[PDB]
Structure formats: structure tokens, C-alpha cells
Amino acid sequence: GXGGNDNXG
Amino acid sequence: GXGGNDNXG
Amino acid sequence: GXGGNDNXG
Amino acid sequence: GXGGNDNXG
Amino acid sequence: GXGGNDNXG
Amino acid sequence: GXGGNDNXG
Amino acid sequence: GXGGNDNXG
Amino acid sequence: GXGGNDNXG
Amino acid sequence: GXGGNDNXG
Amino acid sequence: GXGGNDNXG
Amino acid sequence: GXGGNDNXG
Amino acid sequence: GXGGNDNXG
Amino acid sequence: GXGGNDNXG
Amino acid sequence: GXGGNDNXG
Amino acid sequence: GXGGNDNXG
Amino acid sequence: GXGGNDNXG
Amino acid sequence: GXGGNDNXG
Amino acid sequence: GXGGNDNXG
Amino acid sequence: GXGGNDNXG
Amino acid sequence: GXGGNDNXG
Amino acid sequence: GXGGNDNXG
Amino acid sequence: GXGGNDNXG
Amino acid sequence: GXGGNDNXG
Amino acid sequence: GXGGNDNXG
Amino acid sequence: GXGGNDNXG
Amino acid sequence: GXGGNDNXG
Amino acid sequence: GXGGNDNXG
Amino acid sequence: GXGGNDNXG
Amino acid sequence: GXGGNDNXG
Amino acid sequence: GXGGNDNXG
Amino acid sequence: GXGGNDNXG
Amino acid sequence: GXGGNDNXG
Amino acid sequence: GXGGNDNXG
Amino acid sequence: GXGGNDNXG
Amino acid sequence: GXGGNDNXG
Amino acid sequence: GXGGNDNXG
Amino acid sequence: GXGGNDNXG
Amino acid sequence: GXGGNDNXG
Amino acid sequence: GXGGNDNXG
Amino acid sequence: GXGGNDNXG
Amino acid sequence: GXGGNDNXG
Amino acid sequence: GXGGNDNXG
Amino acid sequence: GXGGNDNXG
Amino acid sequence: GXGGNDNXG
Amino acid sequence: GXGGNDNXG
Amino acid sequence: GXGGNDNXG
Amino acid sequence: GXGGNDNXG
Amino acid sequence: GXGGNDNXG
Amino acid sequence: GXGGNDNXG
Amino acid sequence: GXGGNDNXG
Amino acid sequence: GXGGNDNXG
Amino acid sequence: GXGGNDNXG
Amino acid sequence: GXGGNDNXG
Amino acid sequence: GXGGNDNXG
Amino acid sequence: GXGGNDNXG
Amino acid sequence: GXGGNDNXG
Amino acid sequence: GXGGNDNXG
Amino acid sequence: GXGGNDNXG
Amino acid sequence: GXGGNDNXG
Amino acid sequence: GXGGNDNXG
Numbered sequence: 001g002x003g004g005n006d007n008x009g
Numbered sequence: 010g011x012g013g014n015d016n017x018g
Numbered sequence: 019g020x021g022g023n024d025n026x027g
Numbered sequence: 028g029x030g031g032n033d034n035x036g
Numbered sequence: 037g038x039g040g041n042d043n044x045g
Numbered sequence: 046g047x048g049g050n051d052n053x054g
Numbered sequence: 055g056x057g058g059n060d061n062x063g
Numbered sequence: 064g065x066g067g068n069d070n071x072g
Numbered sequence: 073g074x075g076g077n078d079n080x081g
Numbered sequence: 082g083x084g085g086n087d088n089x090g
Numbered sequence: 091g092x093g094g095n096d097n098x099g
Numbered sequence: 100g101x102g103g104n105d106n107x108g
Numbered sequence: 109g110x111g112g113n114d115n116x117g
Numbered sequence: 118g119x120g121g122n123d124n125x126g
Numbered sequence: 127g128x129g130g131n132d133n134x135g
Numbered sequence: 136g137x138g139g140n141d142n143x144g
Numbered sequence: 145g146x147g148g149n150d151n152x153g
Numbered sequence: 154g155x156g157g158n159d160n161x162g
Numbered sequence: 163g164x165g166g167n168d169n170x171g
Numbered sequence: 172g173x174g175g176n177d178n179x180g
Numbered sequence: 181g182x183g184g185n186d187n188x189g
Numbered sequence: 190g191x192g193g194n195d196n197x198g
Numbered sequence: 199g200x201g202g203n204d205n206x207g
Numbered sequence: 208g209x210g211g212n213d214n215x216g
Numbered sequence: 217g218x219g220g221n222d223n224x225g
Numbered sequence: 226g227x228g229g230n231d232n233x234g
Numbered sequence: 235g236x237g238g239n240d241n242x243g
Numbered sequence: 244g245x246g247g248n249d250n251x252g
Numbered sequence: 253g254x255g256g257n258d259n260x261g
Numbered sequence: 262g263x264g265g266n267d268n269x270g
Numbered sequence: 271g272x273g274g275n276d277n278x279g
Numbered sequence: 280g281x282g283g284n285d286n287x288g
Numbered sequence: 289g290x291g292g293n294d295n296x297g
Numbered sequence: 298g299x300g301g302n303d304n305x306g
Numbered sequence: 307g308x309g310g311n312d313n314x315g
Numbered sequence: 316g317x318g319g320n321d322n323x324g
Numbered sequence: 325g326x327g328g329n330d331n332x333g
Numbered sequence: 334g335x336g337g338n339d340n341x342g
Numbered sequence: 343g344x345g346g347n348d349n350x351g
Numbered sequence: 352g353x354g355g356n357d358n359x360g
Numbered sequence: 361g362x363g364g365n366d367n368x369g
Numbered sequence: 370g371x372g373g374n375d376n377x378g
Numbered sequence: 379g380x381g382g383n384d385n386x387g
Numbered sequence: 388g389x390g391g392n393d394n395x396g
Numbered sequence: 397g398x399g400g401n402d403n404x405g
Numbered sequence: 406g407x408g409g410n411d412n413x414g
Numbered sequence: 415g416x417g418g419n420d421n422x423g
Numbered sequence: 424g425x426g427g428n429d430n431x432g
Numbered sequence: 433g434x435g436g437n438d439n440x441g
Numbered sequence: 442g443x444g445g446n447d448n449x450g
Numbered sequence: 451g452x453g454g455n456d457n458x459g
Numbered sequence: 460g461x462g463g464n465d466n467x468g
Numbered sequence: 469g470x471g472g473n474d475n476x477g
Numbered sequence: 478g479x480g481g482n483d484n485x486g
Numbered sequence: 487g488x489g490g491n492d493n494x495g
Numbered sequence: 496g497x498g499g500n501d502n503x504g
Numbered sequence: 505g506x507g508g509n510d511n512x513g
Numbered sequence: 514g515x516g517g518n519d520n521x522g
Numbered sequence: 523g524x525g526g527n528d529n530x531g
Numbered sequence: 532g533x534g535g536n537d538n539x540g
Contacts, residue, residue, distance in 0.1 A: 001054060001069050001078030002089065002107045002128065004012045004021075006152065006161025008173065008182035009040065009048030010045060010054075010060050010069030010078060011089045011098060011107070011119065013021045015143065015152025015161035017164065017173035017182055018031065018039030018048025019036060019045075019060030019069060020089070020098045020110065024143025024152035026164035026173055027030030027039025027048070028175005028184045029166040031039040031048070032273070036055005036064045037184005038166070038175040040048040041273070041282070045056045045064005045073045047175070047184040050282070050291070054056060054065045054073005056064045056073060062087070062096030063072045065073045071087030071096040071105070072081045080087040080105030084103030085095030089119020089128050090111050095103055098110020098119050099130075107128020108120050109144050109153070111130060113121035116140030116149075117217025117235050118144065118153050118162070122130035125140025125149030125158075126218055126235025126253050127153065127162050133218070134140070134149030134158030135236055135253025136222055136235060137233025137251040139147025139156055139163060139172070145240055145253060146251025146269040147163060147233035148156025148172060148181070154258055155269025156172060156234070156251035157181060163198035163207075163234040163252075167174045167183070168279065170191040170200020171211030172198040172207035172216075172234050172252040172270075176183045177279050177288065179200040179209020179488075181207040181216035181252050181270040186279070186288045186297065188209040188488045188497075191200045196248050198206045198215075198234035200209045205266050206234055207215045207252035208488070215252055216270035217235045218253070222233075224226065224242045227242055227260070228247025228265060235253045240251075242244065242260045245260055246265025258269075260262065271306025272289070272315055272322070273282045276325055276494075278487065280306050280315025280325060281290045281324055285334055285503075287488060287496065288297045289315045289324025289334060294343055294521075296488065296497060296514065298333050298342070299359020299407065300319060300369050302310035305329030305338075307333065307342050307351070308359050308368020308416065309378050311319035314329025314338030314347075316342065316351050317368050317377020317425065319360075323329070323338025323347030326494025326503040328336020328345055328460060328469070332411025332420065335503025335521040336460060336494035337345020337469060337478070341411035341420025341429065344521025345469060345495070345503035346478060350420035350429025354364030356373055357386040357395030359407045359416060363373030366386030366395070366404040368407070368416045368425065375386070375404030377416070377425045379389045379441045379450005380397045380459045384406060384415030384424050386395045386404045388441005389397065389450045389459065393406030393415050397450045397459005402415060402424030406441060406450075408418045408427075413461035413470055414435030414444025414453070415450060415459075417427045422461065422470035422479055423436065423444030423453025424459060431470065431479035432445065432453030433443040433472005433481045434463040436453070440449045442481005443463075443472040445453040452472075452481040460495040460504075460513035460531075464471045464480070467506040467524025468535030469495050469504040469513040469522075469531035469540075473480045476524040476533020478504050478522040478531040478540035485533040489499025489517060495513035495530055498517025500511050504531035504539055506524045513530045513539075518529050522540035524533045531539045 001010045004161045005014045005053045007016045009018045010019045013152045014023045014044045016025045018027045022143045023035045028038040032041045034043045036045045037047040041050045043052045045054045057066045059068045061070045066075045068077045070079045082091045082100045085093030086103035087096045087105045089098045089107045109121040110119045111121040114123045116125045118127045118130040120130040123132045125134045136145045141150045143152045145154045150159045152161045164173045168177045170179045171202030171204035173182045177186045179188045180211030180213035193202045195204045197232045202211045204213045206250045215268045220238045222240045232250045234252045250268045252270045271280045275284045277286045279288045283292045285294045298307045298310040300310035304313045306315045307316045307319040309319035313322045315324045325334045329338045331340045332409045333342045334343045338347045340349045341418045342351045350427045353361045356364030358367045360369045362370045365373030367376045369378045382400045384393045384402045407416045410440045411420045413422045416425045419449045420429045422431045428458045436444040442452040447456045449458045460469045462471045468526030468528040469478045471480045473482045477535030477537035487496045492501045493512045494503045496514045501519045502530045503521045520539045529538045
């Protein structure tokens with residue numbers, strides 16, 4: 001959820 | 010959700 | 019949702 | 028490399 | 037390498 | 046190498 | 055957003 | 064968002 | 073988000 | 082919500 | 091909502 | 100919520 | 109961005 | 118970004 | 127990022 | 136800057 | 145900067 | 154910087 | 163500077 | 172500088 | 181500088 | 190053989 | 199054989 | 208044989 | 217440019 | 226660049 | 235550029 | 244670069 | 253660039 | 262680089 | 271082609 | 280092709 | 289192809 | 298084919 | 307085929 | 316085939 | 325599909 | 334599919 | 343699939 | 352023929 | 361034929 | 370035929 | 379069919 | 388068909 | 397079929 | 406007879 | 415007879 | 424007869 | 433290999 | 442190898 | 451190896 | 460792709 | 469891909 | 478891929 | 487194929 | 496194939 | 505001797 | 514195949 | 523001697 | 532002697 005979850009794939 | 014979730018793929 | 023979720027793909 | 032089938036809340 | 041089928045809350 | 050089927054809360 | 059409701063109410 | 068509700072209420 | 077509710081309420 | 086002091090920065 | 095002080099910046 | 104002092108930075 | 113403050117150069 | 122403060126150069 | 131403070135160069 | 140620094144936000 | 149530093153945020 | 158430093162955040 | 167660089171040398 | 176660099180030398 | 185570098189030397 | 194001088198992001 | 203000088207992110 | 212000079216992230 | 221001098225000088 | 230064919234990408 | 239001098243000088 | 248064909252990628 | 257001197261000088 | 266064909270990737 | 275990508279890419 | 284990627288990539 | 293990736297990759 | 302339903306790709 | 311349902315890829 | 320359900324890939 | 329899948333039915 | 338899957342039915 | 347899977351049915 | 356319900360799919 | 365319910369799929 | 374419920378799939 | 383009669387009658 | 392009669396009559 | 401009669405009648 | 410009987414020879 | 419009998423020879 | 428009998432010879 | 437004297441009901 | 446004298450109900 | 455005198459109900 | 464491939468190497 | 473491959477190496 | 482492979486090495 | 491003379495047969 | 500003379504048969 | 509490059513179904 | 518003369522038979 | 527490169531189903 | 536490179540089903 002608060003924050004950021006990043007993965008390019 | 011608050012924040013940002015970024016992945017190019 | 020509040021925030022921004024960006025991925026080019 | 029560039030953008031697959033993707034759709035986000 | 038670039039973007040598979042992906043979709044996020 | 047680049048992005049499989051992926052989707053996140 | 056995925057059947058969400060993002061609100062402070 | 065995945066049937067979420069992100070709120071301070 | 074996975075049927076979550078992220079809130080301070 | 083009780084005292085409102087619930088904000089990201 | 092009780093005291094309103096619920097804003098991102 | 101009781102005392103509101105619940106914020107990321 | 110909440111608390112807009114970004115300038116490039 | 119909550120507490121916007123990013124500038125590149 | 128809560129407490130925005132990132133600048134590159 | 137020889138141009139660059141382009142971002143969503 | 146020979147250009148660079150491009151980010152979501 | 155010969156360009157670089159690109160990040161989500 | 164983001165685009166699918168699909169170019170035979 | 173993010174894109175699928177699909178290029179035969 | 182992130183992309184699928186699929187390139188025969 | 191495309192025997193150009195291809196030199197861009 | 200694409201016998202170019204391919205030199206970009 | 209793609210007998211180029213391939214030299215980018 | 218936080219005291220910009222990008223310049224072949 | 227001190228030749229030709231450059232790209233501040 | 236936090237006292238920018240990017241310059242073939 | 245002190246030749247030709249460069250890319251601040 | 254926290255006292256930037258990136259420069260063939 | 263003191264030749265040609267470089268990429269600050 | 272149930273999500274067709276037949277492509278030297 | 281039940282998520283087709285037949286591709287020299 | 290029940291998640292097809294047949295590919296010299 | 299009774300109950301026509303065949304599609305190739 | 308009774309109950310036509312065949313699709314190749 | 317009665318209960319047509321065959322798909323190759 | 326590089327062509328194929330030819331059938332009576 | 335590099336072509337194949339050919340059938341009576 | 344490098345082609346194959348051919349059947350009567 | 353008695354009740355007519357006699358059909359391939 | 362008696363009750364008609366006599367069909368391949 | 371008596372009750373009709375006589376079908377392959 | 380070989381002096382056959384294939385019928386539900 | 389071989390002196391056949393294929394009928395539901 | 398071999399002087400057969402294949403029927404539900 | 407209902408159906409299809411295929412043989413190239 | 416209902417169905418299909420295939421043999422190339 | 425219902426079904427399929429296949430032999431290439 | 434291809435097709436002899438053949439004839440079918 | 443391919444097809445002898447053959448004929449089918 | 452391929453197909454003798456053959457004929458089927 | 461079915462035909463009598465009668466071809467001396 | 470079915471045919472009589474009658475071909476002297 | 479079925480055919481009489483009658484081929485002298 | 488990364489040569490010449492190919493056939494998706 | 497990474498040569499020549501291939502057949503997805 | 506037919507000294508060709510014969511490479512098709 | 515990493516040579517020549519291959520057949521996905 | 524047919525001294526070809528025979529390489530198909 | 533047929534001194535070919537015979538390499539297919």
C-alpha cells in the first residue's frame with residue numbers, strides 16, 4: 001500500500 | 010494505494 | 019489511488 | 028524491450 | 037528485455 | 046533478461 | 055482501485 | 064487496491 | 073492490497 | 082480521526 | 091474526520 | 100486516532 | 109507531487 | 118513525492 | 127518519497 | 136543539462 | 145548533467 | 154554526472 | 163530520453 | 172535513458 | 181539506463 | 190545489411 | 199549482416 | 208553474421 | 217543548472 | 226563528441 | 235549542476 | 244568521446 | 253554535481 | 262573514450 | 271497469436 | 280501462442 | 289505456448 | 298466442425 | 307470436432 | 316473430439 | 325505463427 | 334509457433 | 343512450439 | 352423422432 | 361427417440 | 370430412448 | 379459404413 | 388456410406 | 397461398420 | 406457419413 | 415460413420 | 424463407428 | 433511417400 | 442514411406 | 451516404413 | 460505444409 | 469508438415 | 478512431422 | 487535462420 | 496539455426 | 505549430380 | 514542448431 | 523552422386 | 532554415392 005513497489009518486468 | 014508503484018514492463 | 023502509478027509498457 | 032497488456036487503480 | 041501482462045492497486 | 050506476468054497492492 | 059475505496063472520512 | 068480500502072477515517 | 077485494508081483510523 | 086494529524090510529509 | 095488534519099504534504 | 104500524530108516523514 | 113517542489117537544470 | 122523536494126542537474 | 131529530499135548531479 | 140531528467144511527477 | 149537522472153516521482 | 158542516477162522515488 | 167529502441171545496427 | 176534495446180549489432 | 185538489451189554482437 | 194551510424198535513447 | 203555503429207540507452 | 212560496434216545500457 | 221555552467225568552453 | 230554524431234540523450 | 239561545471243573545457 | 248559517436252545516455 | 257566538476261579538461 | 266564510440270550509460 | 275508475439279526482435 | 284512469445288530475441 | 293516463451297534469446 | 302469454435306495464430 | 311473448441315499458436 | 320477442448324502451442 | 329497449423333475441419 | 338500443429342479435426 | 347504437435351482429433 | 356433432441360454440438 | 365437427448369458434445 | 374440422455378461428452 | 383446403418387431412431 | 392443409411396428418424 | 401449397426405434407439 | 410473422413414493419398 | 419477416420423496413405 | 428480410427432498406411 | 437487408389441461413405 | 446489401396450464407412 | 455492395403459467401419 | 464516431397468538432394 | 473519424403477541425400 | 482522417409486544418406 | 491535459406495514450413 | 500538452412504517443419 | 509540447397513514441407 | 518542445418522521436426 | 527543440403531517434413 | 536546433409540521428419 002504507503003510507499004512504492006517497483007519491478008521493469 | 011498513497012505512494013506510487015512503477016514497473017516499464 | 020493519492021499518488022501516481024507509472025509503467026511505458 | 029516496451030509495454031504489454033496492462034490496466035491500474 | 038520489456039513489459040509483460042501486468043495490472044496494480 | 047525483462048518482465049513476466051506480474052500484478053501489486 | 056481492484057474494487058477499492060480510498061477515502062479519510 | 065486486490066479488494067482493498069486504504070483510508071485514516 | 074491481497075484483500076488488504078491499509079489505514080491509522 | 083480523535084485528533085487529526087495524519088498526513089506523508 | 092474528530093479533528094480534520096489529514097492531507098500528502 | 101486518541102492523539103493524531105501518525106504520518107511517513 | 110503533495111508539497112510541489114521539483115525544479116531539473 | 119509528500120514533502121516535495123527533488124531537483125537533477 | 128514522505129520527507130521529500132532527493133536531488134542527482 | 137545536454138538534455139535529460141524527464142519524469143510522471 | 146551529459147543527460148540522465150530520469151525517474152515516477 | 155556522463156549521465157546516470159535514474160530511479161521510482 | 164524512454165522509447166522501444168528496435169533498430170539492426 | 173529506459174527502452175527495450177532490441178538492436179543485431 | 182534499464183531496458184532488455186537483446187542485441188547478436 | 191542497414192550500415193548506418195545509429196547513435197539515441 | 200546490419201554492420202552499423204550502434205552506440206544508446 | 209551483424210558485425211556492428213554495439214556499445215549501451 | 218543550481219549554479220549552471222553546462223558549456224565546450 | 227571532438228568529431229561528429231553525438232546525442233545528451 | 236549543486237555548483238554545476240559539466241563542461242570539455 | 245576525442246573522436247566521434249557518443250551518447251550522456 | 254555537491255561541488256560539480258564532471259569535465260575531459 | 263581518446264578514440265570514439267562511448268556511452269555515460 | 272492468444273496474446274501473439276511471433277517476432278526476431 | 281496461450282501468452283505467445285515465439286521470437287530469436 | 290500455456291505461458292509461451294519458445295525463443296535463442 | 299458441430300459447435301464451430303476453431304481459430305490458429 | 308461435437309463441442310468445437312480447438313485453437314494452435 | 317465430444318466435448319471439444321484441444322488447443323497446441 | 326512462421327506459418328503452419330493447416331487442417332479438413 | 335516456427336510452424337507446426339496441423340491435423341482432420 | 344520449433345513446430346510439432348500434429349494429430350486426427 | 353418421441354422427443355426431437357438429436358443433433359453433433 | 362421416448363425422450364430426445366441424443367447428441368457428440 | 371425411456372429417458373433420452375445418451376450422448377460422447 | 380461394410381453394409382452398416384448408423385442411426386438414434 | 389458400403390450400402391449404408393445414416394439417419395435419427 | 398463388418399456388417400455393423402451402431403445406434404441408442 | 407456426419408463428420409469428415411480425410412486421407413492426401 | 416459420426417466422427418472422422420483419417421489415414422495420408 | 425462414433426470416434427475416429429486413424430492409421431498413414 | 434502420397435495417395436493410392438482410394439474411394440469413402 | 443505413403444498410401445496404399447484403401448477405401449471407409 | 452508407410453501404408454499397406456487397408457480399408458474401416 | 461502436406462505434399463509428396465520427391466526431390467535428389 | 470506429412471508427405472512422402474523420397475529424396476537420395 | 479509423418480511421411481515415409483525413404484532417403485540413401 | 488542468422489544466415490539465409492529458411493522455410494516456417 | 497546461428498548459421499543458415501533451417502526448416503519449423 | 506542436382507547440387508542445390510533444398511530446404512520445404 | 515550454433516552452426517547451420519536444423520529441422521523443429 | 524545429388525550432393526545437396528536437404529533439410530524438410 | 533548421394534553425399535548430401537539429409538537432416539527431416
